[PDB]
Design a protein around this ligand. Structure first.
Ligand SMILES: O=S1(=O)NCN(C2CC2)c2ccc(F)cc21
Ligand SMILES: O=S1(=O)NCN(C2CC2)c2ccc(F)cc21
Ligand SMILES: C=C(C)[C@H]1CN[C@H](C(=O)O)[C@H]1CC(=O)O
Ligand SMILES: C=C(C)[C@H]1CN[C@H](C(=O)O)[C@H]1CC(=O)O
Ligand SMILES: [Cl-]
Ligand SMILES: [Cl-]
Ligand SMILES: [Cl-]
Ligand SMILES: [Zn+2]
Ligand SMILES: [Zn+2]
Ligand SMILES: [Zn+2]
Ligand SMILES: [Zn+2]
Lengths: 253, 252
């Protein structure tokens, strides 16, 4: 029996391979998470089938507590693994079994260069510059439930204007380029664009300390096996090599 | 009540200074003590803190038997292990780690003004000695490492028995008294380098690890503590808790 792997298209984690031949099966995909998935399959000795999740979402719960996206697939036993930049959160951990993190990140700010803005505190105290995050993502949920006075003031801004929240990273990146808009985005993706689009930069440091984990249904025996494999991959400096493999662009002066 | 095994290690678990004799859990204070009180209240359990007898974190011997807090958890003599216990693959095969409550990496503790800039600089030369705490997580990393730089560095530490120190307190002195660089976890480096302005961190972080709460394998408290640690992080409580205990006179 092969494992069902649900995932999403997100640079540079999972991308479509380009080729002259028509590609079938797992051959269609490439990226950091694809290399990580082949490495886990190598260590644990299993075959898998990659399926893009249909609703194209990571996992948010509605007012009635029901989930969507990849997290729902794991809950409904419709998938064995969720290999994607799936942020480890307490609410998601109460529904699925996260492996230990394979990559660290924190929430930060994507914005233009040449601005006296030095922190998220500067965005909260002003109104001319609009800010937001990907709707129903981990970052937006952080601001929604946070009690820090600065982040409470920022969430009142995002929730009041529905256009402040973007559908995905691509729209948020586009909005920071076409309007006076700052995107609250996870640091790993910020590092990826700031090395390829020299117009954008990171503002301030990291506001929190989180990680990406491999999602499994609760009670899955593969969680602890993947955790140990991720630990072996880190100690062998291989998570370091394959991250530098996909994150290194031309750079920005 | 749950039995919690731990170790004396600044600033995670320390003896609370007092004129009168302290008994029970009142004897201890520190970051891990504050974390345990926070976890105990969230999960609603009572506990008894017991310093592990052999005074060790957890290493394997020649016969494969564990010692320290890890063995304490395997033999079910303790329910939780609240200490700066580094999450490693070999330990994860023996106990159930919670998700990390603190991030750290291996780095270098050495004197200021010295030319050494990285661990690779230490490997290429021989006049400046280097090592780590014996049978700790750092030493075990170099012993099993296949990276060519770390394979060479482990040959150096193992060749001269004095390169391995007994604990952090002795290792800090060897950087303060000899031409010696200590391979130390970054969180402990950050703590001392703000108290002893003659020491500094050489280079960046060599790897990326974390401290986790140890439980016996199959413990129902693992996920409960994991979720509680995640809530503590999202509520900025782990940030307040670390800043409280990472004090010092400060160094320019
Ligand atoms: O979501 S976690 O498993 N627990 C929260 N943390 C703690 C702040 C150290 C971190 C820090 C870095 C990670 F990669 C994961 C986590
Ligand atoms: O021991 S872990 O659970 N898995 C290894 N990592 C990965 C380098 C991201 C990290 C990074 C930071 C942590 F706090 C824990 C861990
Ligand atoms: C690319 C997207 C929308 C994902 C990636 N990790 C977060 C998650 O797992 O929810 C989202 C980013 C964010 O919310 O800042
Ligand atoms: C203080 C000591 C000996 C401990 C703390 N964490 C590591 C562990 O959990 O093994 C050790 C440090 C190190 O190995 O560099
Ligand atoms: Cl875990
Ligand atoms: Cl005792
Ligand atoms: Cl931390
Ligand atoms: Zn490396
Ligand atoms: Zn590298
Ligand atoms: Zn028992
Ligand atoms: Zn804070």
């Amino acid at each position: 029996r092969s494992l069902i792997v649900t995932t999403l298209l997100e640079e540079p984690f999972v991308m479509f391979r380009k080729s002259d031949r028509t590609l079938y099966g797992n051959d269609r995909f490439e990226g950091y998470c694809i290399d990580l998935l082949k490495e886990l399959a190598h260590i644990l000795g299993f075959s898998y089938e990659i399926r893009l999740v249909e609703d194209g979402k990571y996992g948010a719960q509605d007012d009635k507590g029901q989930w969507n996206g990849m997290v729902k697939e794991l809950i409904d036993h419709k998938a064995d693994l969720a290999v994607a930049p799936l942020t480890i959160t307490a609410v998601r951990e109460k529904a699925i079994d996260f492996s230990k993190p394979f990559m660290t990140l924190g929430v930060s700010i994507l914005y233009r260069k040449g601005t006296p803005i030095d922190s998220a505190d500067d965005l909260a105290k002003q109104t001319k510059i609009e800010y937001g995050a990907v709707k129903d993502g981990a970052t937006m949920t952080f601001f929604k439930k946070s009690k820090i006075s600065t982040f409470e003031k920022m969430w009142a801004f995002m929730s009041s204007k529905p256009s402040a929240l973007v559908k995905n990273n691509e729209e948020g990146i586009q909005r920071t380029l076409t309007a006076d808009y700052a995107l609250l985005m996870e640091s790993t993706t910020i590092e990826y664009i700031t090395q390829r689009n020299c117009n954008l930069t990171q503002i301030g440091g990291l506001i929190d300390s989180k990680g990406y984990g491999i999602g499994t249904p609760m009670g899955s025996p593969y969680r602890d096996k993947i955790t140990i494999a991720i630990l072996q991959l880190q100690e062998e400096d291989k998570l370091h090599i394959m991250k530098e493999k996909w994150w290194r662009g031309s750079g920005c002066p």
